[PDB]
């Protein structure tokens, strides 16, 4: 562009879509419209608990759950680790981060924190998974 | 009115003071009109006063009045005496 | 101490003595552990640039952040940058209580300064990283001059550098003049550190 062209119309940059977009919203219950927060975790309550099958080459039966959050948006969230204990109407803390195989799953359920428990016999990165130190 | 007073600096348990021409309505630590001096009640032998002695006489001559321990300070300088004198 | 681990295994892995020399790397002069005795492969750029941070820092017992928080004071001065780093660490206080011979090892000349025996300039100082400077006076406390490990350490020392004096009776140093690179630990390529911290 010549310098007159960049003075009439100037250069504009591009915008950042997030990942994780349902963590950037909160709900004002009384005025009754959404609000913006940028929180790192949100609390939810689970409305299903099942398993999906992965994609292109992979293969397994992968445990996941549908959970509606504090603002009232609903999402699927992968349950990590090996065992679990979720039912209907459990209270989970959810966190960012997508699982690549599953289409359309893009949150993770923090193990350790609310109703969810740590994993049952883990010893080596035990603070993901949160389990406590044996003996 | 317009006063001549001390602000407080330093950190906890360890104060330093600047000697200030403010206004009486102001908060201790905010808006001022001039700075005049310095004072350090805690250092070793006696406190270190230090105070420009010809701005302070400008302001005693205009009104300001000193608070009660800036009257023990402009005293050791005999500033409160050359002010007395020019009758 | 802070590290207070095991100094022969760190001496075999990096390749310098780190002590009274030689003795560490004798029978087994290779790295430690199960794949120990079997051929070393090659180290990368990062591989090698990091072996020099870690050489100069396990010598002087510092940790990171204290090591790195010093690295750029050193690089505030005028001069060449990566030799004031070498100098300013020579001038630490447990590092001067070692170059004088007041103790026989570096982990012990820090429990002197720490436990409160040393008294630079007449006043007790117990901060291993105090940063003494040209003209000060390292001495010894007075109820602590017939500690065994002090008289035993001072005889056999045999050496004192040239920016230090040492009045071997009285137990009393000086720290005369700053050092210069010709005298500081010598298996240490100092631009393998300045280029590590510009990554």
């Amino acid at each position: 562009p010549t310098i007159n062209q960049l003075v009439r119309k100037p250069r504009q940059s591009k915008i950042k879509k997030s990942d994780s977009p349902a963590l950037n919203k909160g709900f004002n219950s009384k005025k009754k419209k959404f609000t913006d927060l940028n929180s790192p975790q949100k609390r939810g309550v689970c409305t299903r608990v099942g398993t999906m099958t992965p994609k292109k080459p992979n293969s397994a039966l992968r445990k996941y759950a549908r959970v509606r959050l504090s603002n009232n948006i609903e999402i699927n969230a992968y349950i990590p680790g090996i065992g679990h204990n979720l039912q209907e109407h459990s209270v989970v803390l959810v966190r960012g981060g997508r699982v690549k195989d599953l289409p359309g799953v893009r949150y993770h359920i923090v193990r350790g924190a609310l109703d969810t428990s740590g994993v049952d016999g883990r010893r080596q990165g035990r603070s993901l998974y949160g389990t406590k130190k044996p003996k | 009115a317009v006063k001549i007073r001390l602000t407080r600096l330093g950190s906890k348990r360890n104060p330093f003071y600047r000697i200030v021409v403010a206004d009486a309505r102001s908060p201790r630590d905010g808006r001022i009109i001039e700075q005049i001096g310095t004072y350090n009640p805690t250092s070793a032998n006696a406190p270190e006063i230090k105070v420009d002695e010809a701005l302070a006489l400008k302001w005693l001559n205009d009104g300001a009045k000193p608070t009660d321990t800036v009257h023990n300070i402009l005293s050791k300088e005999g500033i409160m005496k050359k002010f007395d004198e020019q009758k | 101490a802070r590290f207070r681990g095991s100094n022969w295994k760190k001496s075999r892995r990096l390749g310098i003595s780190l002590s009274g020399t030689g003795k560490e790397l004798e029978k087994r002069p290779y790295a430690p552990g199960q794949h120990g005795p079997n051929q070393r492969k090659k180290l990368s750029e990062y591989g090698l640039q990091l072996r020099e941070k870690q050489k100069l820092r396990y010598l002087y017992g510092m940790t990171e952040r204290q090591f790195r928080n010093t690295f750029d004071i050193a690089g505030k001065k005028f001069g060449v940058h990566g030799e004031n780093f070498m100098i300013l660490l020579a001038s630490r206080l447990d590092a001067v209580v070692y170059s004088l011979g007041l103790a026989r090892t570096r982990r012990q000349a820090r429990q002197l300064v720490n436990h409160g025996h040393i008294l630079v300039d007449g006043k007790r100082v117990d901060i291993p990283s105090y940063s003494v400077k040209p003209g000060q006076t390292i001495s010894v406390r007075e109820k602590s001059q017939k500690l065994n490990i002090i008289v035993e350490s001072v005889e056999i020392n045999n050496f004192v550098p040239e920016y230090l004096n040492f009045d071997a009776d009285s137990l009393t140093g000086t720290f005369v003049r700053l050092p210069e690179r010709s005298e500081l630990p010598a298996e240490i390529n100092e631009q393998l550190i300045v280029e590590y911290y510009s990554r």
Binding site: I3, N4, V7, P10 | - | -
Partner: protein
């Protein structure tokens, strides 16, 4: 103390006692450093209305004097 003055050019005359000047100025442009030219119409006040449309004149500033006028005519300088 003294009160700022300008030089101008009259771009209207329809009001009564009241002419509108255009003063021309210039700003560089903080990012690509070329200058630009712009303008801004100062409403000024003349009494026994003299100056005419299109006409380099000169104006000084004063106390507020109607809703929008704040300057007054000083001296014509030339016309056609």
């Amino acid at each position: 103390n003294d009160r700022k003055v300008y030089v101008g050019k009259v771009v209207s005359d329809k009001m009564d006692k009241t002419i509108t000047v255009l003063v021309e100025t210039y700003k560089t442009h903080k990012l690509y450093g070329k200058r630009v030219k712009y303008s801004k119409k100062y409403k000024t006040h003349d009494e026994n209305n003299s100056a005419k449309l299109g006409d380099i004149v000169k104006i000084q500033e004063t106390r507020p004097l109607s809703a929008t006028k704040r300057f007054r005519l000083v001296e014509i300088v030339e016309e056609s």
